[PDB]
Amino acid sequence: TLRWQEDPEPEDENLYEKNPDSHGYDKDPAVDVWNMRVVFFFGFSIVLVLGSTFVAYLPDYRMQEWARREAERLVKYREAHGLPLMESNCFDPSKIQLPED
Amino acid sequence: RDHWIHVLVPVGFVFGYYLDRKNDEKLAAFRNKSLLYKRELKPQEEVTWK
Amino acid sequence: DAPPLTLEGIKDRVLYVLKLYDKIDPEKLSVNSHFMKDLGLDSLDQVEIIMAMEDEFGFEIPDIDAEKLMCPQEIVDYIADKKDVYE
Amino acid sequence: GKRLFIIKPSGFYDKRFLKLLRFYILLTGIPVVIGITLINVFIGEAELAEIPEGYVPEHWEYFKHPISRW
Amino acid sequence: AFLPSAAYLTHQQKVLQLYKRALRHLESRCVHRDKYRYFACLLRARFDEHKNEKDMVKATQLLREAEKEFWHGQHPQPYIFPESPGGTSYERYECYKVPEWCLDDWHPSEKAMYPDYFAKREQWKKLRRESWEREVKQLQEETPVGGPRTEALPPARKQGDLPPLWWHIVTRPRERP
Amino acid sequence: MLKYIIPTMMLMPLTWLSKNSMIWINTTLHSLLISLTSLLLLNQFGDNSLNFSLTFFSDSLSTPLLILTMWLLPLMLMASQHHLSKENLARKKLFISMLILLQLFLIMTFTATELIFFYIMFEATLVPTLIIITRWGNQTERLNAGLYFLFYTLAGSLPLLVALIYIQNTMGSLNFLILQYWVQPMPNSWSNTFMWLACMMAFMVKMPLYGLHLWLPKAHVEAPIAGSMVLAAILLKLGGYGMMRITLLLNPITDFMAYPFIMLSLWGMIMTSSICLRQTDLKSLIAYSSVSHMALVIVAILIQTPWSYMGATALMIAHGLTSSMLFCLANSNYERVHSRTMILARGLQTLLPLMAAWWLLASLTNLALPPSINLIGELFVVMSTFSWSNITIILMGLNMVITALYSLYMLITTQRGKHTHHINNILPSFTRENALMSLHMLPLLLLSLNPKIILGPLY
Ligand SMILES: CCCCCCCCCCCCCCCCCC(=O)OC[C@H](COP(=O)([O-])OCC[N+](C)(C)C)OC(=O)CCCCCCCCCCCCCCCCC
């Protein structure tokens, strides 16, 4: 009648029972402490603080500042000599050929 | 060394950087030949970039 | 705010409210006096007593617990259990 | 004055985590901000100048901050 | 017809509950105490007029017409006690009713701040775990064949033992934690 | 890209030559070091993309996905080291090797300059994911979840390869740098119609699309925590990346072709949000929310405007982080109560205050509270789809309400109200779990300060 000879389902294990100072990494306290130290050092003191410092001081990302500064020059050109600020044609009309129509 | 398993990833990163630098020299068919950045060579300089 | 209630205070209050009832003469009732036999009250009078204590103590007693309360000691014990007195 | 015990869940573990998080953030937050302030005060920022004739700047000489140049 | 101990509501309980609800709604209708007292005496007369009615179906029809009368003229917003369900202060402090077993998960550093209380807690736990098998054997030998009929629990009929299933009712959190 | 592939491949001798119980520490440490070195890919120019060699190149679109993947691997190892504590050492090493191999294929997928190489890695990501789902799951239905996840994707991807090979016989090359200059307009014909279908239906399947989304509620709720993270935060973005790469060749036929899929996604977001309003499972709720957000990304890519592309990539990154956090929250609750029912464990704020704070913060970032990048992406997609048509805002706006109708609901049933009486195994929050949620959230909150690094290749 006893179909499927099977080990009984084990109960849940509480990590705080055998070690009340468990961080939740391993049941061995020294390995758990060292894993906690490694995670908190290389997860917050290395890749977050120094990572955010590296991202904050990026050297002119996508030249987003430079395109401003050159524009600051360029307007000061065409406002000085009476030229229009921007032409309606991106390319020069003299160097482009149209099909006959 | 008693911690020889901790110098596998950094040595791999150094090797990858060295292989990148080696591969960059093989792709130098247009070094100082582009129409935008061509320039006469400065004194005490033999290539524009490595 | 919300001064604590003792068993003596609850018993004094329930005896005061029962003493201010015209159907119950004050010289005969006791704390262990039954409403139906010892005092000769009615079921409607029991409902009136229950709602009088409800309005006196500021909290509502459910009907299933109100129908089983027939003596002042039972009312004192019920209010003591509900208000968690004598801590 | 008849003080009663207040039952609450154990806040020791959450407080320990928050203390460890604050310590491990500040441990490299303080030297980084100290070095950044010392660089900004003493080394300082660059200045915008026109390119002189016969000279071409390096690829890292087009940026203002010392950290960006580095 | 939903009761913890009984299976139905008798006629007397129906009349008493109708009288209580009608008096509460009448108190809600007239604000002042003297007017409420006058109309409560009037309602007491109306209920006392038909007290000694031995005809059962006439009592049933009187109950039905009184229920229709109450439903016709009840207050749209009756007065609700603050701790009563539907009140303003109902189940407000359930966010502070921390169960007792959380004290089993406390750290030993914060368990040393209250030594005597935790000693008494250990004594309580020892009492519960030594009386549990006795009270479950009391329950299993008193419940009839086919399970219990009602939800009423037997008391402690012996000397030295506790009533069965006493832990979660005795150790419930207070109304003002 | 050889400086990132080699340490990732060297992670396997690290995890196989380690000690008896030092595999997790070493793998987490070295994967965090790889994540630190991943920031060198931010050398982006306003006109030119970063080209490394003839095989690998990195634009400003693949770079946030690469950084997210190499950041997600240590979080994955931290998440999947509690339910495997009873596992065999060889099986534990096999699981870690599976995660490492999957991450390697993912970081080789995004940098591929050839569409055939990209497609090869895009299907090579299937095998470790399927193995993880079918081996280290918990329920029976994972076996069924191993089929619907597989034979859907290949059914979209096996025609597409043929279309890609056709390009190899038509344009002469499949290199993305070449195809940006040798592209040709696509005339209206039935052949180009079916070529558009072949090139798109794989990415509609893997995103997923409403109607074709049936594999995602099945492959999310039987999979383990690491599998749920890899499906939610990375593997749904392969379809978006493939769409953004392949839309260039499919012009101008896309203008009248994108209509039925746009309508399908615009109704599917409402349908999946309404489904989220009545789901009894936390994991299924997160899966259907992922379906809704990816339908929004599908609309954004299909209307193909610069604001839509910017909102699409911002929504991709933000949804990946938020869905990963929500799945880790669900995993912690499942590990504590040993069930997936939403209504089972209620009133957890009175027991876990810090987990309640994390739940509130994750639900806050789910409904796109400004100025988070979720609001940035969703807002920009809304602006672009209002430019597309003036009525679609209604189909956006109502959806927003339903979002705020379930996420807070997902909060309340799990956090507020009277606690259940018969559950007394509620342990306090571990340091590992809190570390996991902080590592999930703090980059997401920090990215609001500088969002210009996740605004696509046309910022
Ligand atoms: C990217 C895709 C993958 C995603 C996952 C990534 C995982 C790895 C993460 C690595 C680390 C993080 C990288 C991103 C860093 C983003 C942050 C950053 O550096 O930003 C750059 C930006 C740069 O600013 P900027 O660009 O304006 O400045 C010009 C540039 N520099 C700095 C060189 C001059 O930094 C800041 O804005 C910092 C400003 C100072 C600090 C903040 C001050 C205010 C703080 C709040 C005050 C109170 C407000 C009210 C509060 C009320 C209560 C709530």
Domain locations along chain C: 1-87
Nearest CA to F60 among F2, F5, F111? F111
Give, in degrees to the nearest 5, the angle at Cα F338 between F337 and F344: 55
| Closest residue to E105, CB basis, from F419, F421, F428 | F428
| 3-class state of residue C13 by DSSP | helix
Q: Across the interface, do A51 and F39 touch by the CB < 8 Å criterion?
A: yes
Residue pair F9/B12 in contact by the 8 Å Cβ criterion: yes
Catalytic position from the list C1, C12, C38, C42: C42
Cβ pair F187, F168 in contact under 8 A: no
Cα F321 off chain centre by? 8
Question: Chains with 3 or more CB pairs closer than 8 angstroms to B?
Answer: F
Could you tell me if F451 and F371 are in contact, meaning their C-beta atoms sit under 8 angstroms apart? no
Q: Length of chain C in residues, anyone? A: 87
In this structure, how many other beta carbons lie within 10 angstroms of the beta carbon of residue C4? 12
| Residue of E98, E109, E175 to mutate, testing the D interface (most D Cβ within 10 Å of its Cβ) | E98
Q: What is the 3-state secondary structure (H, E, C) of chain A?
A: CCCCCCCCCCCCCCHHHHCCCCCCCCCCHHHHHHHHHHHHHHHHCCCCHHHHHHHHCCCCHHHCCHHHHHHHHHHHHHCCCCCCCCCCCCCCHHHCCCCCC
Maximal CA-CA distance, chain B: 55
Tokens found for residue F225: 């925590």
| CA-wise closest residue to E20 among E91, E69, E70, E94 | E70
Closest in E98, E107, E110 to D7, CB measured: E98
C51 and E23: CB-CB below 8 Å? yes
Q: Is F51 helix (H, G, I), strand (E, B) or coil?
A: strand
Residues 6+ apart with CB under 8 A from F202: F153, F156, F157, F159, F160, F239, F242
Inter-chain touch B8–F13, beta carbons under 8 Å: yes
- Cα of F229 to ligand 1 centre, how many Å? 26
To 10 degrees, what angle do helices F89-109 and F115-124 make? Answer: 160
Nearest CA to ligand 1 atom 9: F443
Is the Cβ pair F435, D11 closer than 8 Å? no
Q: Specify the 3-state DSSP secondary structure of F57.
A: strand
Question: How many structural domains is chain B composed of?
Answer: 1
d(CA F454, CA F448): 10
Are F288 and F217 a contacting pair, CB within 8 Å?
yes
Q: Does E110 contact D8 at a Cβ distance shorter than 8 Å?
A: no
For residue E177, give the amino acid letter: P
Bridge partners, E46 (sequence order): none
Number of other residues whose CB lies within 10 A of the CB of residue F238: 23
Segment holding F25, helix H or strand E: helix F23-37
**Nearest Cα residue to F330 out of F258, F230, F228:** F228
Chains A and C touch each other (3 or more Cβ pairs < 8 A): no
Q: Does A59 touch chain D (CB under 8 A)?
A: yes
Of F42, A73, F449, A57, the closest CA to residue D63 belongs to: A57
Instruction: Give the sign of the dihedral formed by CA F334, CA F339, CA F342, CA F343.
Output: negative
Q: How far is the CA of F298 from the centre of ligand 1 (A)?
A: 29
Structure-token pair, residue E82 = 């603050």
F92-95: list long-range contacts, CB under 8 Å, 24+ apart: F92/F23, F93/F15, F93/F16, F93/F23, F95/F132, F95/F136, F95/F226
Determine which helix (DSSP H) or strand (DSSP E) holds F58, and give its type and residue range: strand F57-58
3-state secondary structure of F375: helix
Using only the alpha carbons of chain C, give its radius of gyration.
Answer: 13
What span, in angstroms and rounded, lies between the C-alpha atoms of F251 and F196? Answer: 10
Ligand 1 pocket by Cβ (under 6 Å) = A 47-48, 51-52, 55-57; D 65; F 64, 67-68, 71, 317, 443, 446-447, 449-450, 453-454
Neighbours of F152 (CB within 10 A): 20
* F281 SS3 class: strand
- CA F268/CA C53 separation, integer angstroms: 59
**F375 contact partners, CB below 8 Å, separation of at least 6:** F368, F369
Strand F57-58 to F50-51 pairing: antiparallel
* Distance to chain E for A21, nearest Cα, Å: 8
Q: Which of residues 325-384 of F touch D (CB under 8 A)?
A: 350-354
Q: Is there a contact between F286 and F342 (Cβ–Cβ < 8 Å)? A: no
Whether omega before A10 lies within 30 degrees of 0, making that bond cis, reads no
Alpha-carbon distance A48 to F449, whole Å? 14
Contacts of D70 (CB under 8 A, 6+ apart): D60
Chain D residue with the nearest C-alpha to that of E100? D7
How is residue F56 annotated by DSSP? Answer: B
User: CB–CB of F153/F202 below 8 Å?
Assistant: yes
Do A46 and F36 touch, CB atoms closer than 8 A?
A: yes
CA atoms of A39 and A57, how far apart (whole Å): 25
Look at A62 and F35 and tell me if their CB atoms are within 8 Å.
no
F touches B, CB cut-off 8 Å, minimum 3 pairs: yes
Report the C-alpha gap between E110 and E95 in whole angstroms: 22
CA dihedral F337, F341, F346, F350 (to 10 degrees): 30
Q: Resolution of the coordinates in A?
A: 3.5
* Cβ atoms within 10 Å of A52's Cβ, excluding its own: 19
Print the domain residue range for B14. Answer: 1-50
* Local structure of residue E105 (DSSP, 8 states): G
Give residue F3 CA to ligand 1 midpoint distance, Å.
27
8 A C-beta contact, residue E118 and residue E65 = no
C75 contacts: CB under 8 Å, gap ≥ 6: C14, C53, C69
Please name the amino acid found at residue F292. S
Q: How was this structure determined?
A: cryo-EM
CB atoms within 10 A of CB E106: 21
Instruction: Kindly report the protein residue whose alpha carbon is nearest to atom 19 of ligand 1.
Output: A56
Cα–Cα separations (whole angstroms), residue E128 to D18, E138, E165: 37, 15, 10
> Can you tell me the distance from the alpha carbon of F419 to that of F425, in angstroms, rounded to the nearest whole number?
13
DSSP line for F6-24 = HHHHHHHHHHHSS-SS-HH
Q: How far apart are CA B21 and CA E62, in angstroms?
A: 102
CB burial class (10 A; 0-12, 13-18, 19+) of residue B9?
A: buried
